[PDB]
Amino acid sequence: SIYQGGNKLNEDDFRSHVYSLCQLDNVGVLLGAGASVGCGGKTMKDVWKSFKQNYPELLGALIDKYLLVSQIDSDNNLVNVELLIDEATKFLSVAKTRRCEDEEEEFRKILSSLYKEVTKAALLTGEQFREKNQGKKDAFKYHKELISKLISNRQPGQSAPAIFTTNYDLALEWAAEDLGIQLFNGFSGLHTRQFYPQNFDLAFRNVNGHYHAYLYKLHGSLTWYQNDSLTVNEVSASQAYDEYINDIINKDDFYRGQHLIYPGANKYSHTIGFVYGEMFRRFGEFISKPQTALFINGFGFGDYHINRIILGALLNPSFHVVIYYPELKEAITKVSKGGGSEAEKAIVTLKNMAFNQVTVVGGGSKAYFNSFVEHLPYPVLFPRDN
Amino acid sequence: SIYQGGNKLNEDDFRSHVYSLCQLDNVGVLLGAGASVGCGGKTMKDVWKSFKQNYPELLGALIDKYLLVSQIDSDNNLVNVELLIDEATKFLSVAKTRRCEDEEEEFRKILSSLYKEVTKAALLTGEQFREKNQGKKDAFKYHKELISKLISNRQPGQSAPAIFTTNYDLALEWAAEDLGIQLFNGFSGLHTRQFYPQNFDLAFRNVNAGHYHAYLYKLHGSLTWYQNDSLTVNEVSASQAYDEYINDIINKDDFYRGQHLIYPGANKYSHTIGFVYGEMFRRFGEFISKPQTALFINGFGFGDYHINRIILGALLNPSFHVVIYYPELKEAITKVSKGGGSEAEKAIVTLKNMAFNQVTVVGGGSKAYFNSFVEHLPYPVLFP
Amino acid sequence: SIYQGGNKLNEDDFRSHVYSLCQLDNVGVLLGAGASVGCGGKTMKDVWKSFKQNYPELLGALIDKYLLVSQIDSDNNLVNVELLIDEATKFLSVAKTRRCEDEEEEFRKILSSLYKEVTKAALLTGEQFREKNQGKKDAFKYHKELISKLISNRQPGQSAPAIFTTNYDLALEWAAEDLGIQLFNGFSGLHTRQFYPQNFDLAFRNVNAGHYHAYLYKLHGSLTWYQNDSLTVNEVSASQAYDEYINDIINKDDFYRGQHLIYPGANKYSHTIGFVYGEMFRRFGEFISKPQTALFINGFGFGDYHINRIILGALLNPSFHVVIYYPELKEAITKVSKGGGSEAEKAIVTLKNMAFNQVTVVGGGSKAYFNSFVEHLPYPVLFPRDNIVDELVEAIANLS
Ligand SMILES: NC(=O)c1ccc[n+]([C@@H]2O[C@@H](COP(=O)([O-])OP(=O)(O)OC[C@H]3O[C@@H](n4cnc5c(N)ncnc54)[C@H](O)[C@H]3O)[C@H](O)[C@H]2O)c1
Ligand SMILES: NC(=O)c1ccc[n+]([C@@H]2O[C@@H](COP(=O)([O-])OP(=O)(O)OC[C@H]3O[C@@H](n4cnc5c(N)ncnc54)[C@H](O)[C@H]3O)[C@H](O)[C@H]2O)c1
Ligand SMILES: NC(=O)c1ccc[n+]([C@@H]2O[C@@H](COP(=O)([O-])OP(=O)(O)OC[C@H]3O[C@@H](n4cnc5c(N)ncnc54)[C@H](O)[C@H]3O)[C@H](O)[C@H]2O)c1
C-alpha cells in the first residue's frame, strides 16, 4: 500500500495520478528484467544455476583453486555474474601478458559456457521458437495492449511514447505487425540490412494511418553481432536460430565475442560498443524534459549508470517519476539493517529525497507488465459537460 | 490568537495568508540563532557563562580595578559582549596611549580570551571539522528540505529567493551538497575563496535548451572569514581552516588579535577595516524596498540598532509585507510598556503596534521555531 | 618551413588565415603531452628514468618473471606508465585471489615507488604547494591572459568550445579561483563534496543581460581526486592533499595500503572510477555531434585503444580539420632511416604521405615559441599598448 503521514491511501489516487501523467506532454516506459517473466523468462540466478549444473567441474575448481565465489555467499542468495565476466577478461589479459597456457582452458571454457547459458535463458519457447505464427500466441498479448494504448493518446503537438526495455528476450518486435503498429526497429531492405543510427527521425504524417512509436532498448539485442567490419545487425529470429545459435550451443569453440551484448559488471570494460553512449544519451536526455512522466516497471536498481544518471538530473520539478516495487515492507526492513547492494541504496534517496512530487508504488507480484499495461485507460472522445 | 492592524486571523486563515504571500514574487528569511542553537548551538549568554567559568583569575581584580559589572548586575543577566568588546578595545587604546604596561598585558589577555569562547564553541563538530561526509549528517536535514521548498514553487519570470541570517552555525552549505543545491554567498573558488561582486550576476541555463539555487548573505563573518591584515580578505575550506590558524587558538591559550574577521561587537564601526558590512546591508535595505515582497523572521528580538533603522522605514511602501516569529511577544510588550527596553523591545513592540496589517505574527512557544518554518512554506499542488 | 595542404602561400595570407581561424565560434582542442613541454611539464621518459635510478633492480626481474615490458622499449623509454600501473594492479588482484604473496610484495614496492616518482612531479611547486595564490607567478600569468584573449573577443550567446590537455595539474583550479570563476565539474560544493554530473551541461548567465564561465572537463582526473571509503568521489582544498596523502607519496618510503587514489587511471576495472573517467569522454563525444569538430595530435604513442577507437570511428568525417604540432620530424627522419622509428612515428609519417589538404603543420624552429603563440592571437585595437602598470606597482610597493 501507500502511506502518507501515517494514513492509508486509496488506489484511485494513484490511478488518477498516472492518468494525468499520461495526459502530460511526453511519457516513457522503463522495462527491466520483469518485462517478460510469465512468457518463460528466467532471472540471472537461474542462469547461474544452469551454468553450475551443466559444468560442475567449474564450480569445483572455483571452490578449490581460486574461490571467486563462496558457498556461504551463494546460500545468502547474492551471487553476481556481472563481475565474473570482467574478472575472467582481466585474468585473461594478465595471462596474455604472462603466457600461462595450461591454465587457460578452464577459464576459456567458462566464458564459452557462461555465454551459452546466458543466450539460452531468453528464447522462452525452446523449439517452438523456430516456427512461425508465434506472434499471435496468447503470451504476447499484453505487449499488443501497450503497443495500442500509448500510441494513440497523442493529440497534435505531442511526441510519441518512449520504449525503454533492457532484457535479452524477444517480445517487442513480434506484436508490432501483428496489429500493424511498427515499434520502429530501423532496418531497411529485404536481404542485406545494415544498422544506421542516423535513422532517429522517423515519423509518419498524412500528406494525401499516422501511427508510430519509439524503440530504445538499453540492453542491445539477443541477435546483435559484430562481423569484424565494425557493424551491428538484427535480422529474423529463426534465421539466426538456423544460422549461428546452434554453433554456440553445441560446438563451444574457442569463444570470440560472436554476438555482442554486455551483461556484465563494468560497461566501460566493454567500451568497444558506443551504442551504449546513444542509448544512455537518450535516457539522460529524457529525464530533464519538463512535464514528462516515467512509468518504471522492473528497475532492478543494480546497474550503475542508470542509478547515477537518474537522481543526478531530477532537480527540476517538471519531470515526474514513480516505480513499481513489489516488496515494500520487506525491502524497508532489510534496508533498515544495513542496506542491500551498492546501487539499490539509491531507493533510500527517493525514500527521503526533497522532491514532494513522487510516492513509491508497490504491492507485490501484482505490479508487472500485465497490470502495468492494464491499469492504463483508453482515450475518450467527445467530452461532455455532464 | 493572531492579530494585524486590528484584524483577527486564525490558524487556517493564517496558513492561507502565508501561502498567498508565498505566491508573491519574493520572500525573505531570518533563520535566527533559534534554529541551530536548539540542535546543539550556543547563544551569546552561554558563551559569556563559559568565559566566566574559564579564566577564573580576573573576576576578583576586574570587579575591583575596573568594575565593568557588579554582582547584582551579573545576577540580573544584562550582559552583552557587543559593547564589552568595544569597551575593551577603547580601554586598551587608552592604555597604549598612556603606557600602563600592566593594563596593556591585562587587556591583551582580555581580548585574546574573549575572542575564543565565541569561536571555539561555534564549530559544532569538534575535531571532525577537518573530516568529510559531514553534509549527509542527520543534524542538518531540516536545512536541506527547506532549501528545496524555496526553489520548487519558483515559476519562470520570478527572481530567486533570499536567505538573510548571520549566526555562527556552519549549516547551510552543510545542507546544499547532499541535495546538489548551489547557494551563492558572493565568493568564488575552492582554494582561493574571496569576495567577488562579479559573482552576483550568475544564473543557471540549459545549453541544450536539474538546476537549483538560492541566496546566502552573512552579516558578521564566517568562522572561515579572515584576512592576512594586508588588504586581503580570504575564506578557506573547513579542513585547511582548522589546520592553519584555528587549532592553536582553540587549544594553545596564546595571544590573538583580529585574526579572522568575526564581528560580535556593538559599535561595528571601530573596525572600519572591515568593509564587509558596508556592502551586505546595501542589499538588506534594497531587499525590503520592493512592494508585494515579504520577509520572514525566525525568533528575533531586534537588538541591533541598524536592523531597526531600515525596516521601520520600509512599511512606507504599501505592499511590502513582513513576518516575524516570536513566542514570548507578551514579555516584550510588557517590558516596552514599562519603559525599560532597548532597541529590541521598543522596535518589536512598535512594529507590532502599528495600525497597519503588513505585520504578520507567529508565536506560541516552540510553534514559532524552525519547525513551523519548514512546515508552512508551501509546495505546489496540482493533483491532490 | 610552412606546410599547408601542399600549396605554398605568402606570409601575409598565412597570418591572415591563422588570425581568421583563431576567432572561430566553435573550438575543439586536444593537446598532447609534448605540446605543454614549454610550460614546465616533465615527459614520462624522465619519470621512468628517475624511477629506475631510484630502484634499478626492477627491470631485469620484471622482464624475467612478468614480461610486462620489452627490454628495448624500456631502454629507449617507450613504455606506458599508466598502463604499467593498471597491469600491476591486475597482477596484484590476481595474486590476492590466488595468494601469490611472493609476487604481491614484489609488486607493492615498485607500485609505491612509481607513485613516489610520478606524484612528486605533477604538483609543479614542491614546498610552495601549501601556499595560496601560487598561480600569480608571471610565467603562468600569460595563461590567464590567454583565457581573457579567449573571452574578451567573444560575442554573447556563442557556442561552448573545449580544450583538453594531457597534463592534469590543478593549476587550472588555482588560476580560475584567483580569477573568481565558479566551477561545475561534478564536485559542486566546498565542505563535504560529491560527484554530481548533470551540471556538466549547464552554464552561468546574467539575469539582467558578466559572460565569464568555463566548463571544467578534467577527463584525466586530478591530483586531489580520491575515492574515500564510501563508494563515491570527493575533492580537497590544496593543503588537505599536500598534508594528508601527497606527503607520504613524496616523503615516506613505502606507505602503500590499498586502492585509493584516482591518478593515473588506477581502478578502471572497478565500476566507480570507470564511471568517474569515461563519463567525461562520453559527454565530450556527446558534444562532437556537430560537423565542425577540431582535433590536435602531439606525441601520441598509438598504444591506447578507446581513444584510438573513437579516432577510427570519427576519422571518416569530410569536414574534419587537423592541425599537428611536432617540431621533431627533421631530427626523426634520420633516426627512422638509420634504424627505424617507433609505431607512432611510422603511423604519422605514413599519414602525412596522404594527399589531404585538411592537415596543417606549424614549424620554423624559433617561430614555435610560446610567446609567438601569444602574439599570434587576436589583439584588441582599443587596448592601451603601453607600459604604465609596472611603474605604478613599483611606486605602490616602495611606500612603507
Ligand atoms: N549499448 C546498450 O544498449 C547497453 C549499454 C549498457 C548496458 N546494457 C545492458 O544494460 C544492462 C541491463 O541488464 P539487466 O538485465 O541486469 O537489467 P534488468 O533491469 O532487466 O534486470 C536487473 C535485475 O533485476 C532482477 N529483478 C527483476 N525483478 C525483480 C524483483 N521483482 N525483485 C528483485 N529483483 C528483480 C533481475 O533478476 C535482474 O535482471 C546490462 O548491463 C546490460 O544487459 C546495454
Ligand atoms: N556583518 C556585519 O559587519 C554587521 C552589520 C550590521 C550588524 N551587525 C551586528 O548585527 C547585529 C545582530 O547580530 P547577530 O545576528 O549575530 O545576533 P546577536 O548575537 O547580536 O544577538 C543575540 C543572538 O541571540 C539570538 N537569540 C536570543 N534569544 C533567542 C530566542 N529566544 N530565539 C531565537 N534566537 C534568539 C538571536 O537570534 C541573536 O541575535 C549586532 O547587534 C550587531 O553587532 C553586524
Ligand atoms: N589509456 C591512455 O592511453 C590515456 C590517454 C589519455 C589520458 N590518460 C590518463 O593518463 C593517465 C594520467 O595521465 P598521465 O600522467 O599518464 O599523462 P600522459 O602524458 O603520460 O598520458 C597521455 C598519453 O601519453 C602516452 N604515453 C605515456 N608515456 C609514454 C611514453 N613513454 N612513450 C609514448 N607514449 C607515452 C600514453 O599512452 C597516454 O596516456 C591516467 O591513467 C589516465 O587518467 C590515459
- Tabulate helix, strand, coil % of chain A (nearest 5): 40, 10, 50
What SS3 string covers chain B?
CEEECCEEECHHHHHHHHHHHHCCCEEECCECCCCCCCCCCCCHHHHHHHHHHCCCCHHHHHHHHHCCCCHHHHHHCCCCHHHHHHHHHHHHHHHHHHCCHHHHHHHHHHHHHHHHHHHHCCCCCHHHHHCCCCCCCHHHHHHHHHHHHHHHCCCCCCCCCCCCCCCCCCCHHHCCCCCCCEEECCEECCCCEEECHHHHHCEEEECCCCCCEEECCCCCCCCCEEECCCCCEEECCHHHHHHHHCHHHHHCCCCCCCCCCCCCCCCCCCCCCCCHHHHHHHHHHHHHCCCCEEECCECCCCCCCCHHHHCHHHCCCCCCCEEEECCCHHHHHHHHHCCCCCHHHHHHHHHHHCCCCCEEEECCHHHHCHHHHHHHCCCCCCCC
Report the C-alpha gap between A375 and A239 in whole angstroms: 36
CB B302 within 8 A of CB B339: no
CB contact under 8 A, A90 and C93: yes
Report the C-alpha gap between C1 and C362 in whole angstroms: 8
3-state secondary structure (DSSP) of residue A301: coil
Which neighbouring-strand residues pair with C3?
A: C361
| CA of residue A110 to ligand 1 center, whole Å | 22
Angle between helices B101-120 and B81-98 (to 10 degrees): 150
Nearest to A179 by CA among A218, A152, A208: A152
Among chain B residues, the shortest Cα distance to C195 is held by B180
What SS3 string covers B333-382?
HHHHHCCCCCHHHHHHHHHHHCCCCCEEEECCHHHHCHHHHHHHCCCCCC
Take residue A50 and report the three cell numbers written for it. 544452469
Which neighbouring-strand residues pair with B4?
A: B7
* Residue A365: φ, ψ to 5°: -70, -5
The ligand 3 site (C-beta within 6 Å) comprises C 33, 44-45, 77-82, 166, 168, 220-221, 263-265, 301, 303-304, 307
3-state secondary structure (DSSP) of residue A27: strand
Q: Which of C46, C78, C82, C225 to mutate to test the pocket of ligand 3 (most atoms within 8 A of CB)?
A: C82
3-state secondary structure (DSSP) of residue A89: helix
Nearest CA to ligand 3 atom 21: C166
The residue whose grid cell reads 520572514 is: B296
Report the C-alpha gap between B164 and B194 in whole angstroms: 19
Among chain B residues, the shortest Cα distance to C203 is held by B205
| CA of residue A33 to ligand 1 center, whole Å | 5
Cis peptide bond N-terminal to C264, omega within 30: yes
Nearest CA to ligand 3 atom 42: C265
Ligand nearest to the CA of A217: 1
Chain B residues with CB under 8 Å of A285 CB are: 208
Chain B residues with CB under 8 Å of A317 CB are: 152, 380
Q: How far is C210 from chain B (nearest CA, A)?
A: 7
CB atoms within 10 A of CB C198: 22
What SS3 string covers chain C?
CCEECCCCCCHHHHHHHHHHHHCCCCCEEEECCHHHHHHCCCCHHHHHHHHHHHCCCHHHHHHHHHCCCCHHHHHCCCCCHHHHHHHHHHHHHHHHHHCCHHHHHHHHHHHHHHHHHHHHHHCCCHHHHHCCCHHHCHHHHHHHHHHHHCCCCCCCCCCCCEEEECCCCCHHHHHHHHCCCCCCCCECCCCCCCECCHHHHEEEECCCCCCCCCCCCCCCCCCCCECCCCCCCECCCHHHHHCCCHHHHHCCCCCCCCCCECCCCCCCCCHHHHHHHHHHHHHHHCCCCCCCCEEEECCCCCCCCHHHHHHHHHCCCCCCEEEECCCCHHHHHHHHHHCCCCHHHHHHHHHHHCCCCCEEECCCHHHHCHHHHHHHCCCCCCCCCCCCHHHHHHHHHHCC
Cα-Cα end-to-end distance for chain C: 54
Nearest to B380 by CA among A8, A355, A314: A355
Burial-class residue C282 by CB neighbours within 10 Å (0-12, 13-18, 19+): buried
Q: How far is C278 from chain B (nearest CA, A)?
A: 21
CB C197 within 8 A of CB A314: no
A271: nearest CB among C94, C271, C306: C306
Report the C-alpha gap between A341 and A78 in whole angstroms: 9
* Exposure b/e, B27-48, CB count within 10 A at least 16 = b: bbbbbbbbbbbeeebbebeebb
* Exposure b/e, C368-381, CB count within 10 A at least 16 = b: eeeeeeeeeeeeee
* C330 Cβ contact partners less than 8 Å away, ≥ 6 residues apart: none
The ligand 1 site (C-beta within 6 Å) comprises A 32-34, 43-44, 166-167, 218-220, 262-263, 267, 273, 275-276, 279, 298, 300, 302-303, 326
* C79 Cβ contact partners less than 8 Å away, ≥ 6 residues apart: C48, C69, C73
Residue A335's H or E segment, with its range, is: helix A329-336
At C288, the amino acid letter reads: I
Say which experimental method was used.
Answer: cryo-EM
| CA of residue C52 to ligand 3 center, whole Å | 19
Cα-Cα end-to-end distance for chain B: 29
Q: Which of A218, A271, A304 to mutate to test the pocket of ligand 1 (most atoms within 8 A of CB)?
A: A218
| CA of residue B80 to ligand 3 center, whole Å | 62
Take residue B201 and report the three cell numbers written for it. 550576476
Report the C-alpha gap between A355 and A305 in whole angstroms: 21
At B45, the amino acid letter reads: K
Nearest CA to ligand 2 atom 12: B304
Angle at A73 between CA A70 and CA A77, to 5 degrees: 135
CB contact under 8 A, C192 and B134: yes
B201: nearest CB among C173, C207, C235: C207
* Exposure b/e, C22-45, CB count within 10 A at least 16 = b: eeeeebbebbbbbbbeebebbebe
Nearest to B308 by CA among B343, B341, B273: B343
Nearest CA to ligand 1 atom 5: A276
Cα-Cα end-to-end distance for chain A: 33
- Per the rule left: phi > 0, alpha: psi between -120 and 50, beta: everything else, B56 is alpha
Which neighbouring-strand residues pair with A164?
A: A30, A216
Chain A residues with CB under 8 Å of B150 CB are: none
For β-strands C321-324 and C359-361, DSSP reports them as: parallel
The residue whose grid cell reads 590573538 is: B256
* A273 Cβ contact partners less than 8 Å away, ≥ 6 residues apart: A220, A232, A260, A262
Ligand nearest to the CA of A364: 1
| CA of residue A300 to ligand 1 center, whole Å | 6
CB contact under 8 A, A98 and C67: yes
CB contact under 8 A, A277 and C275: no
CB contact under 8 A, C239 and B234: no
CB B147 within 8 A of CB C163: no
CB B201 within 8 A of CB C210: yes
Which neighbouring-strand residues pair with A295?
A: A29, A322
Report the C-alpha gap between C121 and C113 in whole angstroms: 13
Nearest CA to ligand 3 atom 1: C304
Q: Which of A39, A78, A166 to mutate to test the pocket of ligand 1 (most atoms within 8 A of CB)?
A: A166
CB C377 within 8 A of CB C23: no
Q: What is the DSSP letter of A197?
A: T
Resolution at which this structure was determined, Å: 3.6
CB B305 within 8 A of CB B346: no
Take residue A161 and report the three cell numbers written for it. 511514447
Report the C-alpha gap between B368 and B117 in whole angstroms: 28
* Range list of H helices, A224-309: 237-240, 246, 275-286, 304-308
CB contact under 8 A, C204 and B202: yes
* B78 Cβ contact partners less than 8 Å away, ≥ 6 residues apart: none
Report the C-alpha gap between B309 and B326 in whole angstroms: 20
Distance of CA C132 to the CA centre of its chain: 23
Cα-based torsion angle of the residue sequence A69, A75, A76, A77 in order, rounded to the nearest 10 degrees:
80
Task: Verify whether ligand 2 is closer than 6 Å to residue B86 (CB atom).
Answer: no
Report the C-alpha gap between C2 and A31 in whole angstroms: 58
CB C271 within 8 A of CB A306: no
Mutate which of B133, B154, B174, B191 to test chain C, going by most C C-beta atoms within 10 A? B191
Q: What is the DSSP letter of A30?
A: E
* Exposure b/e, A209-231, CB count within 10 A at least 16 = b: eeebbbbbbbbbbbbbbbeeeee
CB atoms within 10 A of CB B355: 8
